[model samples]
Target chain A: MDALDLLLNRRSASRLAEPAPAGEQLENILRAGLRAPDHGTLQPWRFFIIADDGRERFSQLLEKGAREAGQDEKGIEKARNAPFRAPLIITVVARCEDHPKVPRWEQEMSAGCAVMAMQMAALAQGFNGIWRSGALTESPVVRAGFECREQDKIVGFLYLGTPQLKASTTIALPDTAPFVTRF
Target chain B: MDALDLLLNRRSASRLAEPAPAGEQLENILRAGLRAPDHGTLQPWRFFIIADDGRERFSQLLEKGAREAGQDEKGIEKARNAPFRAPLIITVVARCEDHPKVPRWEQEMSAGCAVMAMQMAALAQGFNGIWRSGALTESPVVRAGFECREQDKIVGFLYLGTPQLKASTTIALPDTAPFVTRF
Candidate 1:
């Protein structure tokens, strides 16, 4: 696949099924994510790969975290089922420390870059994924279960699998003219 | 180039010269950046494309911003010359608003994703670049000059051009084992 084509046509798949990237494909996806440019070579990104039975454990952790965070029953139920939205869930976490050369925000952004790279790599291997985050991402119980420090952030939970529907290559995209400026 | 090859071998070129992406190539790069997975479609990313004479103005702005931020004279001088490191400098800014669905950090990370995509798109078009951020990025004067709101952040200043030195595809990369876990 052409790199530009992947970049331009890639869209998040909200509905996904089984057949997620596994074996070498999964390793390659993780490798691509680890390649994200990190200023000062801090390598702040951490990932949790959840699949099969692990997804069930993830659901339990999420539900427990949400419940502990004082979320309503509806929200907790939604959290429990969120992991099953895809065949695999790779949680991207930013393990940051206070650095003089690279600030915490930059470290967090580096983790975000990793997420984007992994998503593209998954798509390159015929897998579809969506980067997702919400209130559960910031829940203290979730953070503790993930073993993240107070400064660390759950950047995103990437849901990866085969798409239930075909992605539209002809979809109209937002124009860049409005976002660009000559300075 | 193969999409996976690009993802696997892509390396930042710290040294750059003239002949940055222009015309259609530049447009394609910007379009790729605009396609970053922005949650809620907030379109938080804004880019300032600085080239040729604009680079001179950007240098001046950096110098002034650094001085205003109380950077030392040497640091200020370095800031002034930072824009000359490449033929083109695209400043990625996050214009985030208080959103119910999305947090400010996620919006900022989306801008970072835009930077990564733009860098890759440029590489696909035979152009090379590096993502840079420093004290000037957090300078109030720089923020004001870029027309950024109080909540906005200067995600990165991407230095783009033809590479002065070839990027080594064979360069050793960090292992991801330490960063991965099963959940």
Candidate 2:
């Protein structure tokens, strides 16, 4: 596929199941991820690939995190089921420490760029899913489950799998001019 | 270029100069930015396209932010000259707000994704440069220049222009296996 074409047309998969990336395809995704721009080469990004029983464990953590957030039983169940929506879940984490030249927010943004790059890499490898994170991302209990220190931040829960249905997102895309201008 | 190929080899231009994306190309780049995977339909992304004399003013803001940070004259001059390295400087600001279903960090990540998508779009359109940000990104003075509020953030300084030199970026790559595994 043309690089620009993918850039212009790639869409998030609404439903994702099995048939995930393996071997070189998965490695390509990581390469794409590592290629994301970094300032001062801070390289503050890290990732956890959750699969197999790990997803189940993460689901439990999600449930606990939800419970900590005061979410009801239904919300806890939703959280538990969330990690199972896809075959693979890449938890992108940002190690944002104070720096003289680089700010913590920028480090966090670099991690975000890594997640976006991974999504594109997944698409390039014929895999897809929604990039997501919610209350659990900030829940202390959940952060402890991941053994994330105080400064480390969870940037995304990138669910990955084959799209259940495909669309020709040969997007006619809405006008973006409203957001751009010369100054 | 092949989408996957670009994913593997899209190196940031080490040096950037004039001849940036213009008119429709500019629009396409921005459209690519707007296509980023945003959670909860928050669309917390914005781009400020700075060019010509705009760079001069922004450079001054950079200097002001630097001096405000208590940097010496050399550092201030570096900040002042920073914006001229490219034909255009697209300042990516994330307008993250309070959301029940979505966290502020996720919203900010959505904006970060937009900046990276724009970088890839710029590359596909034959332009590229390093994404950057510094004290100015968080400086109250510079934030005022960009009219950013307390919650708003400068995710990146996406410097755009022609690549000064090219490489095979068949990047001799690195062993990134440490960053991935079945958890």
Candidate 3:
């Protein structure tokens, strides 16, 4: 697919199936993360490419968050099963810092770009995905499970797979002129 | 250009020139922002698309940051002139919130994806850009100017313009496979 087409028309597939991006597609997908624009050469991003049995470990972590939020049995089950919904889940983390120049926000933004690029790469390879985040990120148990700190954080979970339902692609809806100003 | 080409070869251009993305290109650049993967549908992102006279206001903000950081006079001038490197500078800001379901990190990531999408969209339109954050973002002057609070921050300044040099269609040595695991 053309790059602009993917950028302009890319959609998010929530209902995903197995057979996630693998082989060359997977390699390039990961490549996108590395190519993100990082100021001062600080990569400032971390990723956990979770798949197969690894999903089990993360599910337990997600369960802790769901249960803490007082979720019902079905909700807890859904939280536990979130990683399993897709064949592969890439957990993106940001390493924000108090640099003399670079702010913590820049580091977090760098990670965000990398994760989004990974999602776009998936779309280019005939795969589809959805990025998700929830109470799991705020849970202490989940943070301890991943050793996440005040300076480093899980940004989003990029779920990769085939679309169970065709994702809605009409994303260019919000007017841009309203956001622009001459002054 | 192919989507994967942009994904693998999209390098940041530091020395940018005038004629920033306009019309459809500019709109899609912001559209790319709207397509970002947001947790909790919070859409925790804001942008300041500065150009022409607006650049002067931001440059003053940058100067305030530079002066407080004890930068020399030349450095102060450079700081004031930083936004003029390109015709358009998009201030990517993240609105972190204390949500019931979403965490602060997730909101930051959503903003990151949006800003990065804007960068990629600029590339797709043949304009060049580099994501930057330094004394500009951390400066109290700049923050106060934006009316930003503790829960919000400037992620970076997406400097967009025409490319001054041939964008190297390649990147550094980061073997992505090492960052992945089958488990």
Better of 1 and 2 by lDDT: 1
DockQ-better candidate, 1 vs 3: 1
Model 3: clashing residue pairs?
Answer: A3-B3, A183-B54
User: In candidate 1, which residue pairs clash?
Assistant: none
Best by TM-score: 1
Give the C-alpha miss distance for residue A166 in model 2, angstroms. 3.2
A162: Cα error in model 2, Å: 0.7
Off by over 4 Å in 2: A68-70, B67-70
Worst lDDT window (10 residues) for model 3 chain A? A174-183
User: What lDDT score goes with residue A144 in model 3?
Assistant: 63
Q: Number of the top candidate by lDDT? A: 1
In the range B1-183, model 3's lDDT, one tens digit per residue, is: 888888888777878888888877888898888777887778777778888888888888889889988889998999988988889999877877788777676777777777778888888888878877766676777877766788897776888999888667555635765344443
Tens-digit lDDT track for model 2 on B1-183?
789888777677758877888888888788888988887888887688899899998988888899999989899989988988888889888887888887777777788888888888888877876677765677888888876788888787888888887635655764586565455
Report lDDT per candidate: 0.90, 0.81, 0.78
* Cα error of candidate 1 at position A181, Å: 1.1
Cα error, candidate 3, residue A65 (Å): 5.7
> For residues A1-183, what per-residue lDDT tens digits would candidate 3 score against the true structure?
888788877677888888888887888888877888776768777778788778898898899888987989999999887788888898887766677666666676677778788888888888988877665776777766665787887777888998777555455477666544443
What DockQ, on C-alphas, does every prediction get?
0.78, 0.70, 0.59
- Of the candidates numbered 2 and 3, which has the greater TM-score value? 2
* lDDT of prediction 1: 0.90
TM-score of each: 0.97, 0.93, 0.87
> Which portions of model 3 miss their true places by more than 4 Å?
A64-75, A95-99, A147-151, A167-172, B68-74, B95-98, B147-150, B170-174
After superposition, candidate 1 runs with Cα above 4 Å error: B172-174
